[PDB]
C-alpha cells in the first residue's frame, strides 16, 4: 500500500536513529504512532488557521507550533534546524539569502 | 522529504485544507525531530530498566511523554 | 625582510580588493522594506555595511586568538549571516547558536 | 619571524574567505580580465609568491 | 562536409542570439538546430572556438532544460581545448541560472576529455571552485573525480582534511571519497591522523572501459643544499640514484636490501658501523628459522630457500665480500650437514667466505669439511675443488690490493705479509694434502686429476 510504503521510509529513520534491530510488531505500534501524530498534526493546524479565519496553511503557523513544543526556543530558532538537518536544496528555498544588489531569491 | 507522500496525507485525512510551496518541508522538519526525541526516550527507557531490546511498554511510555507535548 | 615587504603589498591590494568588491555589489541595507500592505515592526538600531561587518569579525579574531565569539545583535542581518555560513566562511557555536565566529582555514 | 608565522596565517585565511565572497555573490567575474586575474591570483599560497 | 559545415556556422550564430521574440517557429527551427548539433559532431568534429560558444549558452540557461541537455551528450572535438575556455565556464554556473542535471553532463564531458587538453595551468587556479562543489549532494562523484586529477603538492590543505572528515562522519563511507583520500595520503601523509586500509579497489573508472562509458553516455546517471632526507620510493630506475647518493635515507627493514639492485649500490661504498650490525641481526634470523633442517620436511618451502639462496650468492659476488652472517651460519651447519640436499647451493656459500687466519678456520671448516672429503662421492670431491679454487680466487684477489690501500701505518708490513704468507702456504699444502691422499681413495682416475690441475692454474 502506499501509506505503508510512504510510512516505511520513516521507519528505516527510526532503525537508524536507534542503532538498534527493532521487531517487526514493534514498528507496527511506530506506524500506529504516526498515523494518530498525523492526525494530531492535521488538528493543530485547523485550530491554527480557524483562529485567523483562513483555510491555506501559511509559515508563521508552522513556526508557532515548534515554539508551543519546545523545539524553537529563544537561544534556538527556526533557522538552526534548517541549516544542519536539510540539505542545501531545501536550505536555498526556505532560509532568504544574500545576493548582489540586494536581492533575494526566495523573496517575501 | 517525500513531498508526494505528504500531499496524499493532507488531502485523504482532512479534505478541506490547503498547503502552500515550501510548507511541507517543515513538516518533515518536524518529523525528523519527532522520531528523532522518540528514540532518545527509548533509549532512554531502555537503558535505566537494562534491557537491551527495546521492548513494546519502551515505545508505550514513550507515546505518553512525547505525544502530550504535541497537544500545544 | 622583503618578502614580508611583499606580502603587506599584496594585503593592501587585497584589502582595496576587498574593499571594491563589497562596495559596488553589496550596498547599505534599507531597513524601510515591505512596507506595502502591511507593517512589520523592526528596531531603532541602524544596519551597517557588509564590509564593516567582515572588518569586526577580522579584528575579533586576529586581536584576540581566544574569544572569536560575536554576539548576533539588532547591527546584523540574518541573510549577512546566511551568506557567512552557507559557504562555510563562519561557524555558530553547537552548544548556543546565538554566537557567531570567523572560522580559521590553517588545520 | 613570528610577524610571518601569523601574516601568512591572516594571508591564508582572508584569502579563503574572499573567494567563498566571490562565489556566495553571484557575480558574473568573467568579463572584467583586473577580476579574472585576482581569481585566478586567489589560488596561490605564500610558497609561489 | 562544407554543407555540414555551413549548417552550423548559421546554427552557432542562431543560438548566439538568445531566443528571437515575436516568433512562433521555436518548435521547428531551433529544433532542427539542435539536430544539427549531433551530425556533424559524430562524423567530422568542431573547431575550438565553436566549443566556446557552445559551451556558454548551455550553462547560462537560455532555451531551457530539455535543450541544453542535448548539446552537452554529443559533442565531438577535434583540435585542442583551450584553458580560457575552462575559466569562463565556471563562470556562468557561478550565475545560478543552471539545473541539476545539467550540471552533471558539464562534469562528465570533463572527465572524458582529460586527455585532450595540454594546457592545465588556469584548470589548475580553480580548484578552490572545485573543492566547494561539494555542498551539493547530488553532484559528489561527479566533483571527487575532478578533484583527483587536478591535485598537486600544494592543493592537499589541512582544512580540506577536516572537511572531508566530517563527510566520512555523517554520510559514511563512499568509494569517491576514500579514493580522494588515498591520493591525499599518496601526497601528504602527515596532514591526515585517520589511517586507511591498503586493499585492491579499482578506485574509479579505469581498465580502458571508453566504449562502455559511450553506450552509458546516451541516457544513464545523468539525472542525480637539503640537508634532510630523500624517499627510497621515489627512485625508480638507474638516474634516479644518480643524481641523489648525498642524501638517503634509512628504509623500515634490511629485507628489502636484497629485492633491489639499486640499494646494494649503497652498501658498496658505505661504511657506516650500525648499517652492518643491523643487517647481521636480521638474516642470521633468516637463515636459523627459515632453514631445511627445522621444518617438517616441505619442498615447497626448501625450493623458496634454495631461491633465497640464489639472492644470497649474486650479493655476495656483486659486493665482493662475504657477509658476517653467511659465515656464522657455516660454522653451526658445517657439523650438521650430511652431503646433499642442495649441496650445490651450500658448497657456494663456503666459495665466497673472506680471509681470515688459518689456525681460527681449521677447526671449524677443514675438519667438518675432511670428515665428507674423503668418505661422500666423486662428484662431491670435484665440488669441493672447485669451491676451493674460487676461495682462492677472493682471498688472493683481497691480498693483492690490501698492499696498495693502507699507507698508514709507519711500521713496515713485512710481518703482516709474513704473516699472511704462512696463512696462504698452509692454505694450499691442506688442499695439496687434500689431493695427494684422495688419489689413492680412487686409485688414479683422471676425472679427478683434471680438476687437480686447475686448482693449481690459480
Known amino acids: 500500500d502506499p501509506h505503508k510504503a510512504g510510512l516505511s521510509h520513516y521507519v528505516k529513520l527510526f532503525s537508524f536513529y536507534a542503532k538498534m534491530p527493532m521487531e517487526r510488531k514493534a514498528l507496527e505500534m511506530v506506524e500506529k504512532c504516526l498515523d494518530k501524530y498525523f492526525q494530531h498534526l492535521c488538528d493543530d493546524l485547523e485550530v491554527f488557521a480557524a483562529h485567523a479565519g483562513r483555510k491555506t496553511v501559511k509559515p508563521e503557523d508552522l513556526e508557532l507550533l515548534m515554539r508551543r513544543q519546545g523545539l524553537v526556543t529563544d537561544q534556538v530558532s527556526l533557522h538552526v534546524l534548517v541549516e544542519r538537518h536539510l540539505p542545501l536544496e531545501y536550505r536555498q528555498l526556505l532560509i532568504p539569502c544574500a545576493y548582489s544588489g540586494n536581492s533575494v531569491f526566495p523573496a517575501q | ?49 537494562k534491557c537491551r531490546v527495546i521492548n513494546k511498554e519502551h515505545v508505550l511510555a514513550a507515546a505518553k511523554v512525547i505525544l502530550k507535548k504535541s497537544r500545544g | 625582510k622583503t618578502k614580508m615587504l611583499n606580502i603587506k603589498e599584496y594585503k593592501e591590494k587585497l584589502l582595496s580588493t576587498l574593499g571594491e568588491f563589497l562596495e559596488d555589489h553589496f550596498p547599505l541595507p534599507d531597513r524601510s522594506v515591505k512596507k506595502k500592505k502591511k507593517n512589520i515592526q523592526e528596531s531603532s538600531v541602524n544596519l551597517i555595511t557588509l564590509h564593516e561587518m567582515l572588518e569586526i569579525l577580522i579584528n575579533r579574531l586576529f586581536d584576540v586568538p581566544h574569544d572569536p565569539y560575536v554576539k548576533i545583535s539588532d547591527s546584523f542581518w540574518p541573510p549577512y549571516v546566511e551568506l557567512l555560513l552557507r559557504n562555510g566562511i563562519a561557524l555558530r557555536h553547537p552548544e548556543d547558536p546565538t554566537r557567531i565566529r570567523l572560522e580559521a582555514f590553517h588545520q | 619571524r613570528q610577524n610571518l608565522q601569523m601574516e601568512i596565517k591572516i594571508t591564508t585565511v582572508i584569502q579563503h574567505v574572499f573567494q567563498n565572497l566571490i562565489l556566495g555573490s553571484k557575480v558574473n567575474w568573467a568579463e572584467d580580465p583586473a577580476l579574472k586575474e585576482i581569481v585566478l591570483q586567489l589560488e596561490k599560497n605564500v610558497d609561489m609568491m | 562536409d562544407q554543407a555540414e559545415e555551413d549548417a552550423l556556422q548559421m546554427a552557432v550564430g542562431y543560438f548566439e542570439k538568445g ?188 581498465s580502458e572501459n571508453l566504449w562502455k562509458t559511450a553506450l552509458l553516455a546516451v541516457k544513464q546517471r545523468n539525472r542525480g643544499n637539503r640537508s634532510g632526507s630523500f624517499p627510497l620510493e621515489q627512485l625508480q630506475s638507474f638516474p634516479q640514484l644518480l643524481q641523489n647518493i648525498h642524501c638517503l635515507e634509512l628504509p623500515s627493514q634490511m629485507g628489502s636490501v636484497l629485492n ?30 627459515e632453514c631445511i633442517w627445522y621444518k617438517v620436511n616441505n619442498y615447497e618451502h626448501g ?126 699444502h691442506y688442499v695439496g694434502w687434500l689431493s695427494t691422499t684422495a688419489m689413492r681413495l680412487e686409485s688414479n682416475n683422471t676425472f679427478l686429476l683434471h680438476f687437480i690441475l686447475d686448482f693449481y692454474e690459480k
Not at chain 5, 370 to 383: E, G, H, P, R, V
Request: charged residues 20%.
Open chain 5, 260 to 289: 633491489n639492485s639499486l640499494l646494494l649500490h649503497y652498501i658498496n661504498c658505505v661504511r657506516d658501523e650500525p648499517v652492518l650490525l643491523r643487517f647481521y641481526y636480521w638474516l642470521s634470523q633468516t637463515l636459523q628459522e
Open chain 2, 1 to 49: 522529504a517525500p513531498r508526494g507522500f505528504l500531499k496524499r496525507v493532507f488531502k485523504r485525512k482532512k479534505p478541506q485544507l490547503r498547503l502552500e510551496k515550501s510548507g511541507d518541508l517543515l513538516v518533515h522538519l518536524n518529523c525528523l525531530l519527532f522520531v528523532h526525541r522518540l528514540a532518545e526516550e527509548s533509549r532512554t527507557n531502555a537503558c535505566a530498566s
Open chain 5, 19 to 206: 531566443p528571437i521574440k515575436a516568433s512562433q517557429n521555436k518548435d521547428k527551427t531551433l529544433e532542427k538546430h539542435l539536430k544539427t548539433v549531433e551530425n556533424v559532431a559524430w562524423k567530422n568534429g568542431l573547431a575550438s572556438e565553436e566549443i566556446d560558444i557552445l559551451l556558454n549558452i548551455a550553462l547560462s540557461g537560455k532555451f531551457g532544460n530539455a535543450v541544453n541537455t542535448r548539446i552537452l551528450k554529443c559533442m565531438i572535438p577535434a583540435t585542442v581545448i583551450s584553458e580560457d575556455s575552462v575559466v569562463k565556464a565556471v563562470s556562468w554556473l557561478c550565475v545560478g541560472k543552471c539545473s541539476g542535471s545539467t550540471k552533471v553532463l558539464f562534469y562528465r564531458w570533463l572527465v572524458a576529455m582529460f586527455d585532450f587538453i595540454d594546457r592545465k595551468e588556469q584548470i589548475n587556479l580553480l580548484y578552490g571552485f572545485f573543492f566547494a562543489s561539494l555542498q551539493d549532494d547530488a553532484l559528489c562523484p561527479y566533483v571527487c573525480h575532478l578533484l583527483y586529477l587536478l591535485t598537486k603538492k600544494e592543493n592537499v590543505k589541512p582544512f580540506r582534511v577536516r572537511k572531508l572528515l566530517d563527510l566520512q562522519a555523517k554520510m559514511g563511507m563512499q568509494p569517491h571519497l576514500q579514493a580522494l583520500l588515498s591520493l591525499y595520503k599518496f601526497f601528504a601523509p602527515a596532514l591526515i591522523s585517520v589511517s586507511l586500509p591498503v586493499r585492491k579497489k579499482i578506485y574509479f573508472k579505469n
Open chain 5, 303 to 428: 625450493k623458496e630457500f634454495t631461491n633465497f639462496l640464489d639472492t644470497i650468492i649474486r650479493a655476495e659476488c656483486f659486493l665482493q665480500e662475504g657477509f658476517y652472517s653467511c659465515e656464522a651460519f657455516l660454522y653451526k651447519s658445517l657439523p650438521l650437514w650430511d652431503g646433499l640436499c642442495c649441496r650445490s647451493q651450500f658448497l657456494q656459500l663456503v666459495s665466497w667466505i673472506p680471509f681470515s687466519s688459518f689456525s681460527e678456520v681449521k677447526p671449524l671448516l677443514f675438519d667438518h669439511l675432511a670428515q665428507l672429503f674423503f668418505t661422500s662421492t666423486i662428484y662431491f670431491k670435484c665440488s669441493v675443488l672447485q669451491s676451493l679454487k674460487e676461495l682462492l680466487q677472493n682471498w688472493l684477489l683481497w691480498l693483492s690490493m690490501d698492499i696498495h690501500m693502507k699507507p698508514v701505518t709507519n711500521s713496515p708490513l713485512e710481518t703482516t705479509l709474513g704473516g699472511s704468507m704462512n696463512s696462504v702456504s698452509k692454505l694450499i
